[PDB]
C-alpha cells in the first residue's frame, strides 16, 4: 500500500539484496504517497517480491507544506530520519545495494540526506530518482556530494518547482507514468550493473 516498512520490520537474518528508501511529497498519505507504490511494484516485478525491501520515510518526516520554505527544502528532523534509515540499512544489511527516491519535498529530503551521509554509505546507493525536485535549479540538477551518473531527475517542462518556485502546477502532478516506468527502470539498471 501507501505504507511500507520492510527495512524497519526486517532483521539482519532476513536481509533482502536491494533496499529502496523513498520520501513522499508534502501532505501525502502513508510513507510512500502517490508515486512510491508504483515504483515499488515495478522493483518487485524485476527483483522478485523477496528480492527487495521497500521502506518509506515516516517517523519524524511529517511532510508539512510549510517546511518547503526552510533552507534545504525540508526540516532538519526529516533529514535526521532519512539518515537514520540509510544507517539502519547499512547496519542491518551490510551487503545490500541501496537505492533511493523522493517526490517534491521528499526529493529535497533525499538530496539533503544523501549530501549529509558519509561516503561509505553514500557509495552503496547505486541510484537515486527525484521527481518534481524542488531544489533542481538551486542545486543545478544534482544531489550534492553524489555523482550525476547515479542521479535521475524527473522535472517536467512547466513544473515550476524545478525552476526555483514553490508553485504547484499541473506538470508537478503528472509524474505517475515516470514512477511506473522510467524511474524504476533506471534504479533496476543501476542495481543490476553493481550486483
UniProtKB/Swiss-Prot annotation:
Active-site residues, as the UniProt record annotates them: 104 (nucleophile), 159, 172 (proton donor/acceptor)
Effect of substituting residue 166 to A: Increases activity on p-nitrophenyl butyrate, poly(ethylene terephthalate) (PET) and polyamide 6,6
Enzyme nomenclature, EC number: 3.1.1.74
PTMs per UniProt: The 2 disulfide bonds play a critical role in holding the catalytic residues in juxta-position; reduction of the disulfide bridges results in the complete inactivation of the enzyme. O-glycosylated; contains one mole each of mannose, arabinose, N-acetylglucosamine, and glucuronic acid.
Catalytic activity, reaction form: cutin + H2O = cutin monomers
GO biological process: carbohydrate catabolic process
Enzyme class: hydrolase
Result after altering residue 173 to A: Increases activity on p-nitrophenyl butyrate and decreases activity on poly(ethylene terephthalate) (PET)
Places the protein is found: Secreted
Disulfide bridge partners, by residue number: 15-93, 155-162
Known regulation of activity: Inhibited by n-undecyl phosphonate (C11Y4). Inhibited by paraoxon.
MF (Gene Ontology): cutinase activity
A GO term from the CC aspect: extracellular region
Function: Catalyzes the hydrolysis of complex carboxylic polyesters found in the cell wall of plants. Degrades cutin, a macromolecule that forms the structure of the plant cuticle. Allows pathogenic fungi to penetrate through the cuticular barrier into the host plant during the initial stage of fungal infection.
UniProt name for this protein: Cutinase 1
Lineage, opening ranks: Eukaryota, Fungi, Dikarya, Ascomycota, Pezizomycotina
Portion of the full-length sequence here: 33 to 227 of 230
Amino acid at each position: 500500500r501507501t505504507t511500507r516498512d520492510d527495512l524497519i520490520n526486517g532483521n539482519s537474518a532476513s536481509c533482502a539484496d536491494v533496499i529502496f528508501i523513498y520520501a513522499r511529497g508534502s501532505t501525502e498519505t502513508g510513507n510512500l504517497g502517490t508515486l512510491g507504490p508504483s515504483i515499488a511494484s515495478n522493483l518487485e516485478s524485476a527483483f522478485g517480491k523477496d528480492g527487495v525491501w521497500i521502506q518509506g520515510v515516516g517517523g519524524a518526516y511529517r511532510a508539512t507544506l510549510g517546511d518547503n520554505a526552510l533552507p534545504r527544502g525540508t526540516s532538519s528532523a526529516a533529514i535526521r530520519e532519512m539518515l537514520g534509515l540509510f544507517q539502519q540499512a547499512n547496519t542491518k544489511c551490510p551487503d545490500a545495494t541501496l537505492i533511493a527516491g523522493g517526490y517534491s519535498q521528499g526529493a529535497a529530503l533525499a538530496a539533503a540526506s544523501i549530501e549529509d551521509l558519509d561516503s561509505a554509505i553514500r557509495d552503496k546507493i547505486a541510484g537515486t530518482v527525484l521527481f518534481g525536485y524542488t531544489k533542481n535549479l538551486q542545486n543545478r540538477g544534482r544531489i550534492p556530494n553524489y555523482p550525476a551518473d547515479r542521479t535521475k531527475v524527473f522535472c517536467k517542462t512547466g513544473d515550476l518547482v524545478c525552476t526555483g518556485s514553490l508553485i504547484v502546477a499541473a506538470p508537478h502532478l503528472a509524474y505517475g507514468p515516470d514512477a511506473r516506468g522510467p524511474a524504476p527502470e533506471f534504479l533496476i539498471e543501476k542495481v543490476r550493473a553493481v550486483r
